[PDB]
Design a protein around this ligand. Sequence first.
Ligand SMILES: Clc1ccc(Oc2ccccc2-c2nn[nH]n2)c(Cl)c1
Length: 133
Amino acid sequence: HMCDAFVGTWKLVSSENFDDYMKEVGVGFATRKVAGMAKPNMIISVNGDVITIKSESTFKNTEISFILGQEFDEVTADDRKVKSTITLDGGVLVHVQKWDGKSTTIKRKREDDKLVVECVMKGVTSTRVYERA
Ligand SMILES: Clc1ccc(Oc2ccccc2-c2nn[nH]n2)c(Cl)c1
């Protein structure tokens, strides 16, 4: 029942500083513009030890399935091929992505009725707020 509070169907309702975050990641102009429009839905489910996060948008659909603490390969919406490890730290899902000698951390937490996603690349944070769909 670990991530039970994350389970469900979520829709992006607000974003802050996402363009700057993408710039810091290395996303190019066209992908930044198109990705920045999107209002993804995220579907989170758990089956035994396997957590699945599916994201659907006009731009791209993504999907990751993983076991906490166990590194896996991930294709991001901006098409990076990364090595990802996701843990739980005090009720927060902590997701580290490594590629090309770079690293970014995405933290997901429940706050009131929202699922708040903080994406950090060096000194730059973007906050992406989801509500139940
Ligand atoms: Cl399908 C889909 C999935 C994620 C997306 O946005 C991102 C793109 C790059 C890095 C982080 C995020 C993000 N947004 N909320 N959580 N992570 C988009 Cl635009 C579309």
